[PDB]
Structures are given as structure tokens and as C-alpha cells.
Design brief:
Two copies of one chain form a homodimer. By secondary structure, chain A is an alpha+beta fold. Chain A is 23% helix and 33% strand. Chain A contains 13 helices and 30 strands. In chain A, the strands form four sheets. Chain A has an eight-stranded mixed β-sheet with strand order 3-2-1-4-7-6-8-5, sandwiched between helices. In chain A, strands 13, 14, 17, 18, 19, 20, 21 and 24 form an eight-stranded mixed β-sheet that branches. The structure holds chloride ion (CL). Chain A: Residues 221-319 form the TarS/TarP linker domain.
């Protein structure tokens, strides 16, 4: 009967903070009697549980319960899981929202493929990607790729309820644990769960809400490595498939242990460094097998080797040398063609978007430029980039400013070259061409009117640069394509944006008007205002209005009339319908297409 | 010397506390006040040399000094200027002298004129008085004999241009004193109709009072480009259409009525385009041109930086870009180098106005410095640069430049406070009518120390990504940034020489900077912190710190925190004595 159960823990949660959440559930296309809401309050000390209980009385599919306070959301999640009746369970946190077609699409995907876990595409407020690797294409048999299919391991997936009960998969109830959701998803996979990835529709919006946690638990350096030790022991004791154990070992050794040996060494005091360095050296010796480092890139093998040697001074010097390496992309050309937007971009590896990043060519080896002092202490292959010069990636991406959803722009062609600038020094240059088909990223009705931000992702030599596309010159190009206003522009921050639906810019203002080509039809009451610079493809009819005020009347009253933006035969124009309005004299015309007024100083004599 | 002081809602104690710090004999300079206050009388009775537009013209005859200056509110005057300006004007018999002026912001002030001293600077023309600030030194004889006077009456813009031009028109002898920084201007016409009524009054003053044709065409060219054509560039992108239409029609009316046609012959290509379209009334083309010209600059990166002998050396590279991003390009059509423009604008213009062919050899590329405490700017002499026009793709050409220069910090030290202050490096690139004077930047971390003739110098990439040079530990600790080879620490328990050598540093000459240290017990959170004497030595291409414990009374392992010139270290020096 019930397809989905929504599990939402609360604690001193005001009803106003649930307004956006409850609104996103009401907007679900799935019938309300086919899902249920299970709120479990963690023993609120204030009077917020009373207001929530009264709120649920008007909603039959919503049940609320309070337990004794546990100081954590794991026990509320478990209590609600055993209360739930639905076939699938979504763990929805009260600060987050869901997209309107999530329940319909996810359940159909899971039921038609008999999935135990549907890892749906998740969206975050910040960043240019989330789940870039896994949220690529739909995969009903995702567990065949190994335990990696569940990354990123947030709890915001849809888990089959009976599968959790049969395997007794719960959240840790006792002491608080870091990366608790990693334990939960890993336990689900090692019990043979069928995993499906739904990547073609954003399902969950994980919202950043000024996380000034102010918790000594999350800042205690000894607690941190106590939690890291038990996380790795959990891997080694429970994950028995060699392929999946080795992946989790390398992934978390790279991110959490090796991740303090880079920029982190430049923004921490010396005593904090000594404490966490000795913790990391001991953990690598005790829990990280030596073969794991063979799966790491060159720069991480150097960090691994120097860590096990206890050479903190060399790692500090290397952190200073690597600081600032990036790859910013510049727009070399941008234009509309037919029904798409085209880009030509260029990039190169630099230090802070300044001087070039170099690599030396000694003998037949492309080597990392390092001091002779540090270089004479490392294995010679670890600073040899020769085998890695053919594995650069250069791709475009897009991000909706309202939905915060992120997509890879397919169909691009790129090329990365290793060029000799001078002597034996080599830079890394990249070129790319791609087109944007905005229909590929419009899924919900609200997506049709949205500013879009364009980014570039450049990887190579172990570095990853996912940054916004930028330009120096002023760029303003307009287009009217199949009932969609489109403008590519250098925004106020100096980055490239695409405003569709006149949510930022007026297309009449940015295109300009053929001033001496305005036609006034007296017998028809139609005023034609042709647009100057604009790319028009297909038929378009966009309705707005126009305000008329007589010239020279300081306090003149607005004469609101109807207007239309018409795209027809590769030409755009605004038709101001005057009808039978009694008018005479000179007037000011101000178009208002899609809630955006122009500043073209249009005057008209009638 | 007589100093004038105009009270305008009068800071008053501050101005007297700065003027009394001069080197010249106090009974050799006079101070004149005008208030036509009850606390003014009390400041005059305390000490002798203090008498108590319209307020400044009465004070001109009221004074009895050979040379007189016009000191404004909140403005500073450097210590040695009084005597240096008097001896320079007397031995050269100057009617007016323009000492080196200093502003808070920017990387230069009077770049062209204030480069070299010239006591016979009136030979070149009226340009020698630029920039025409009221902050020069004037002789009472030439002012009273020629009746040169701030135009009393309603507030007039560029009265400094009136007061400085009227002096030169009446045959004034002026010397440029770029040897030493003198006046410090702290600073701190809004209506569009007031603005252009004043601009009309300025140009009418030129052709009515300036008789020398060379001095007339200069002022006519210099101010038509800055104030009239100056609103046709970025200004068109920062104002509303109403303001633009009112101001553009004023600018068009002044060009037609006052500015002759032959003035455009002395302008560069881009300004000739602005003059042509202005007289045509084509505001649409100028607005489009402002969008195309926006963001054009040239940023310089550090290719290499090192100490050699007793100088700091740099090797920089630059390239004309749009806002430090993609490259600025010029087109090669037929045999001429054209600027990239649409066909709608290129067809509306004379073909010569967008041809950079005869200008590709006029590029400049020079260095600069600035004392962060003094805000004084200088040009680094003895530099080698080269600009190249390089084909990148198809017929598109970019402007690339490379440059090498060295720095001697004793050249820019003039006051006792100049010995210890941060220094900021900058580059100046000029070409095709554009001028980019930006700070020297670097992306990678740069930290290099040196010990040269008791000067402790460090070149470092600052928090803003720019190049800075700390001299005297005003910002950084040379011990921390040089490193410490703790394995080579020596201990002479007999006399007490606790030797601490430094790792990476460029030592030159002999140096002997003194300081102290602070010792603490190991791990014991708190205890009596007793400080001991310490000393920093630089001998024979090596630097070392020698701690002094002549009265030894410690036992166990101890923390050593050096402290040279008020800058401790983070080297974690644990000593065991
Ligand atoms: Cl924007």
C-alpha cells in the first residue's frame, strides 16, 4: 500500500524551519496516500514537539513520536525505521528538501529493477560537482562496479525496508561516531544489496545552513584519529571482498590520512601538525598495507613514502612548492549557432592564475621540479611524469543557480599538450570546444527560468581543478531560440553565466533596438520594434507588456498596454499592441518582456 | 620660509605637531595664520614664530619669508624638506620650485617630470609645473611683483591650475626637485552643469591668457584629452543614460567651440577615434567602443628573483590582457597592424585612426618601488626590457614583454625611518595609448632572506599575491624565514656562546644586529620567563645568532625563542643546558 516512508528526526525544531521541507513533500507527483511521513523527536527540551504533534493531526499520512533524548539522530532514525510501513525508506534531514518528481521516479526505478538501494543524484549548495564519478548515467546493476557505486555515501538514498530488517542494518546507537553514514552504506553493500544509480534526475538537495557546529567533539584532534582508526578497522574486519576492501582503503587513506600532508600543513600550527602527523604515521604502519600505495598517483606515493619515513620537514617543503597549482579556463570565443550555444576555451597549469607551472625534461624523463635536497631522498620513479602525460582530462560543466544541480556537458572535444616553453621546462596547455543544449538540463518547470553558471574541470598529474569559466573582455550575446530567451554574459564576478527566461537581464536591452526602423500602424494599433543584435532560430512568441507615459508630463500616469516578443525567420521584434487606446502626442515606450524592462529610451509619436 | 595656514572650520594641534619636526633652524621659518580662533591666540603666545583664496591672498603680503608654501589641511611635510628646498632655490635663484610630491594611493605621482632634478626646468615649457598642485614653494617677490593671486570669489575648480599657470605666463623660473620627497597630500563639482561651466572657464582662461603657442597647445591638448575625452572611455560604462546625454552634449559643444581641429594631431590613435566620433555626435559608437576597450591592462609575473652581491635581482614577464585573463590581440590586415573592431565602427572611422603600425616601437616597460610607511614612489634605474609583437594564431598578434632589473635599497633610503619599512615592487607598461602601472605579482610561494651591510632584507609574496621587501624586520622575522640547522648548534658552556646558525640566506658584508631571547622550561605550561641577551652576526657569507648567558643559573632542557628587532621565530629551538 505504502511505497515510500520519509524518516525525519527532530530536536527543538521550530515549525517554520520545516516550511520548505513540507512544501517539497506536498509538491511530490506521487499520490499522498502512497507515501508516509515518520517524524521522531529526540526528546525536545523546549515546546516545539507540541506544535509538531498538532501539525500532524491534519495530515493522515504523517505520524510523529518522541523518545527519550539521545543527543544524536541515529536512535530517532532507527525508531522511525521500525515504525515505517513503506517499501522504501528515505532519510530526509529537516534542513533539506526533495525535488517534485523524486518519489515517482525513484520508486519506479527501484521497483522495476528490484533494487535494495537506489542511490539517486544528490545536489549540494556549494561546489561545481557532487558525485561527478557515480552520478553519470543510470545503472540498474550498479553493484557490479563494486562498493564504489554507493559513493558519495550520504544517507539520502532510498533503502528497501525489509532488506534493512532482514540484515539488521541500523545506525550506531551508542557513542557518537564520525562518518556514521559510511558504516551504514558499507553494511548495506556487504550484505549483497542490489544497488541502482538514478543519475538523470536530481533527487535530494542537501542544503548548507551556516554549519557553525561549535562542537568540541569535531575539533578534538585525538578524537579525530580515534575515529579514523575505528573506521579503518571497520573496513579491515568486515569488508571481505578484496576488490571492495582495497578501494575503501585507498580512497580513505588518500582523503583523510594523506589529506593532511598537503595544503593542510600550511594552515596549522606546529603542535597541531606534530600531533596529527604522528597519528597518521602510526596508522599507515599499523593498518595500511604497503601494496595500497601502488594504487596512488605519483604525488601521493611521495606523500606515502615520506610519511612512513617520518620526514615531516620534506613534506612541509613540498607543501610550499605545490601551493597554488591550478588551471583556470578562458573563453576564446562564444557564439550561438542554430539552437545551441558554442564555446572555445583555453587553459594552462599555473600558480594562482599567474606564471606557468613547469616540469623538467632531464634525459628521456619528464620530471617534477623539486629541490635536489628533497629529490635525492625519494624513489626515482615517484617524480617521473612520463607515463602520466597521456591521461589529462578537460571537460565542461554547468550549474543551475536556483536548483544548485550540477551536470557534465557531454559532446565536448578537448586536447591537452605538453609544450616546451624554454630550456628543458614544459608547460601544460589545453584547448576545448563544446556546445550547450539547455533543454538537456531543464527537468522541472522551474528550470526554464534560471541563470546557469558554466565551469571547467581539468585533471592531470594528480591535480583536480574544477573552476568557473571566466573572461576578461565584456561579453554580451543574446538569442531567441524556440520560445526561450538566452543571454551569455560576463557576470558581476567576472564569470560566464547563461540567463534563460529573463531572470537577470533584459534581452531587449542587451540586443538593442533598430531605433530608426520602428513602425507604427495607425489603423491596426500595432507598434513594431525590431531587435538589433540577436540570434533568432525557430518560432518564438513571448508575452509581456509595455508602459506608456506622455513626454514632458513630470507626474504622468502610466498607460499599461500589452506587448509580445516575436521570433520569426531569424529576426526578433517587440510588438506593442495599442488597440483602440485614445492616444496622441509623443510618448515613452518601455518594454516589459518576462518581467524585465529595457533602458533603450524608446520614444514614439502618435 | 613663511608658512600660510588657512582655517576652514578649524587637526589644528596636529598640523603644528608636524611642522615643528623640521630640520632647519626654527627662527629661520615663519608661520602665518588668517582668521577674519580664541584657541589660535593661545597657540601663538606659547611660542614665538606664529602670527595670528581670500584668507591666503592677505597672508601673501603679510609674510616676510623669502619662499612661501601653501599648506593645506591634514597634509604632511617630510623632515628635511625645509632646508633642502631653501638651499635649492637660493643657489639657483628660482621663482618657484616643485619638490617631489607624495600621494597615499597609486604607484607614481609626476612620473615624467619628477624623474630627474632640473634647476633650469623652465626651458621645456609649461609642462615642468605638472602636476600643478598648490603644494609648491613660491617667492613673495615674484608673487607681489606680478600680482599673482588665488581668484577670490565663488569656489573655482582647478584654481591651482590658474595660480600655477599665471606664474609661468609672467615668465617664471622653476626648478624640479626630484632628489627628495617634500609634500605629502592626504586629500580626503558634483553637478554636471557646474562641472562643464567650470571646464569652459578653464579652457577660456587658456586661450585668453597663455600667449606662448607651445604652452598654449600643450594645455589645450593635455586637458582636452583628460577632462573632455576622459568621459568617453570607462566613464560611459559607469553612468546612467540621462547623465551621459547631458554630459556628452556639453563635451561635444566644447570641442566644437573651443578646441581647434589641429589639436587632434598630437593625440594618440585611440584618442583620435574618440575626438572624431565626439564631433560626429555618434554616442552609440563610443558606448560600443567603451565595452571593447574595457579591462585592457598588462600584469607582470616574477620569472626569477634572487640576491646577488649587495642587490636584489628580478626577472619579470608581462603580456597585454583583458583583465589579466585572455590575451589582447591586434589584427594584421594587408601590411598594417589594425586594432580589432567591428565593421560597423571601422567603416564609420578614417582608416588611419585604427592603424597601430607607426606605434609598435613606442612600447615602454619600466620598474617601480614604494615605501609602505612613507608612500613615496621611485623609478628603479638601470633596467633592461624588451617588448615583442608575437603572432599567436592566424593574423592575431599579442604584445609580450620581458624585463630584468636590480634593486639597491640605499638609493631610496633618505630618512631614519626609511631604513626600517616595507617596500612594494611594481611595473609600468605603456603602449598603444594604454598605461598599466600595477604591482609585481607571483603565484608560487616566494620567501628569500639576505644579510647585506646591517640591512636585513626579505623578498616575499605577501598576503595579496604581490611582491614585498621587508627591510629591518618591520613585518617578517629573518630567523624564521631563513631556517635553522639545529644539528650545527654549538654550546660554549665556559663563556656562554650559544651559537645558532641559519640555513638558507644570502650573507654579504659585515653585520651586527643585536637583540634578546626568552627561555622557558620544557613542557611545563608556565614558569618564570626570564629574558637573556642575544645577538645576530653575519660573517664571511654566513649568518648566525649568538645567545648570551654570562650569568648562568638554569638547569635542564629549555625553550629558546629568538627575538631580533622585535620579531620572534617559530623554529622550536629546544636547548639542553
Ligand atoms: Cl548574474
Amino acid at each position: 500500500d505504502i511505497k515510500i516512508s520519509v524518516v525525519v528526526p527532530t530536536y527543538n525544531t521550530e515549525l517554520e524551519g520545516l516550511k520548505n521541507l513540507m512544501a517539497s513533500i506536498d509538491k511530490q507527483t506521487m499520490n499522498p496516500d502512497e507515501y508516509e511521513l515518520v517524524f521522531v523527536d529526540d526528546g525536545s527540551t523546549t515546546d516545539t514537539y507540541e506544535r509538531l504533534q498538532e501539525f500532524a493531526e491534519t495530515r493522515p499520512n504523517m505520524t510523529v513520536k518522541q523518545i527519550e533524548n539521545s543527543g544524536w539522530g541515529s536512535r530517532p532514525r532507527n525508531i522511525a525505521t521500525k515504525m515505517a510501513k513503506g517499501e522504501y525508506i528515505l532519510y530526509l534531514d529537516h534542513d533539506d528538501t526533495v525535488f517534485p518528481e523524486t518519489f515517482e521516479r525513484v520508486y519506479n526505478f527501484g521497483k522495476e529493477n528490484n533494487l535494495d538501494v537506489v542511490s539517486g543524484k544528490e545536489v549540494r549548495t556549494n561546489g561545481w560537482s557532487w558525485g561527478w564519478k557515480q552520478f553519470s548515467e543510470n545503472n540498474p546493476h550498479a553493484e557490479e562496479m563494486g562498493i564504489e557505486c554507493l559513493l558519495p555515501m550520504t544517507p539520502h538514498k532510498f533503502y528497501k525496508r525489509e532488506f534493512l530488517l532482514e540484515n539488521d542494518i541500523t545506525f550506531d546507537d551508542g557513542a557518537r561516531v564520525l562518518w556514521e553514514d559510511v558504516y551504514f552504506n558499507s553494511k548495506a553493500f556487504i550484505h549483497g544489496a542490489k544497488v541502482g544509480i538514478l543519475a538523470d534526475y536530481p533527487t535530494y538537495y542537501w542544503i548548507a545552513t551556516g554549519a557553525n557546529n561549535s562542537s568540541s567533539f569535531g575539533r578534538d584532534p585525538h578524537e579525530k584519529w580515534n575515529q579514523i582508526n575505528k573506521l579503518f578497522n571497520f573496513f579491515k574486519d568486515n569488508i571481505k571482498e578484496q576488490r571492495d576492501l582495497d578501494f575503501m582503503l585507498t580512497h580513505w587513506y588518500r582523503s583523510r590520512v594523506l589529506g593532511i600532508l598537503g595544503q593542510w600543513l600550511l594552515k596549522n600550527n606546529n603542535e597541531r601538525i606534530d600531533i596529527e602527523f604522528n597519528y597518521a604515521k602510526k596508522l599507515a604502519e599499523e593498518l595500511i598495507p604497503a601494496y595500497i600505495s601502488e594504487n596512488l598517483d605519483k604525488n601521493n606515493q611521495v606523500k606515502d613514502y615520506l610519511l612512513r619515513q617520518g620526514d615531516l620537514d620534506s613534506l612541509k617543503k613540498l607543501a610550499q612548492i605545490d601551493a597554488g597549482i591550478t588551471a583556470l579556463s578562458y573563453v576564446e570565443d562564444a557564439y550561438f549557432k542554430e539552437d545551441k550555444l558554442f564555446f572555445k576555451t583555453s587553459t594552462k597549469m599555473t600558480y594562482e592564475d599567474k606564471e606557468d607551472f613547469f616540469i623538467e625534461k632531464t634525459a628521456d624523463r619528464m620530471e617534477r621540479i623539486l629541490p635536489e635536497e628533497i629529490k635525492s631522498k625519494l624513489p626515482k620513479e615517484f617524480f617521473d611524469y612520463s607515463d602520466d602525460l597521456a591521461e589529462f582530462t578537460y571537460e565542461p560543466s554547468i550549474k543551475g543557480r536556483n536548483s544548485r544541480a550540477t551536470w557534465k556537458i557531454d559532446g565536448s572535444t578537448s586536447n591537452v599538450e605538453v609544450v616546451n616553453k624554454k630550456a628543458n621546462l614544459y608547460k601544460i596547455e589545453g584547448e576545448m570546444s563544446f556546445s550547450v543544449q539547455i533543454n538537456d538540463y531543464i527537468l522541472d518547470a522551474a528550470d526554464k527560468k534560471q541563470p546557469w553558471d558554466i565551469a571547467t574541470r581539468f585533471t592531470g598529474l594528480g591535480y583536480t581543478s574544477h573552476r568557473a569559466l571566466t573572461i576578461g573582455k565584456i561579453l554580451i550575446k543574446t538569442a531567441l531560440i524556440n520560445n526561450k530567451t538566452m543571454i551569455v554574459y560576463k557576470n558581476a564576478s567576472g564569470l560566464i553565466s547563461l540567463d534563460v527566461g529573463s531572470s537577470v537581464r533584459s534581452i531587449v536591452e542587451d540586443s538593442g533596438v533598430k531605433r530608426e526602423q520602428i513602425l507604427i500602424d495607425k489603423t491596426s494599433g500595432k507598434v513594431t520594434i525590431p531587435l538589433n543584435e540577436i540570434h533568432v532560430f525557430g518560432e518564438s512568441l513571448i508575452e509581456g507588456n509595455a508602459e506608456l507615459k506622455p513626454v514632458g508630463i513630470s507626474d504622468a500616469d502610466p498607460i499599461n498596454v500589452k506587448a509580445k516578443l516575436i521570433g520569426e525567420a531569424n529576426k526578433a521584434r517587440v510588438e506593442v499592441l495599442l488597440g483602440d487606446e485614445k492616444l496622441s502626442g509623443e510618448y515613452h515606450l518601455v518594454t516589459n518582456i518576462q518581467g524585465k524592462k529595457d533602458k533603450q529610451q524608446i520614444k514614439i509619436t502618435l
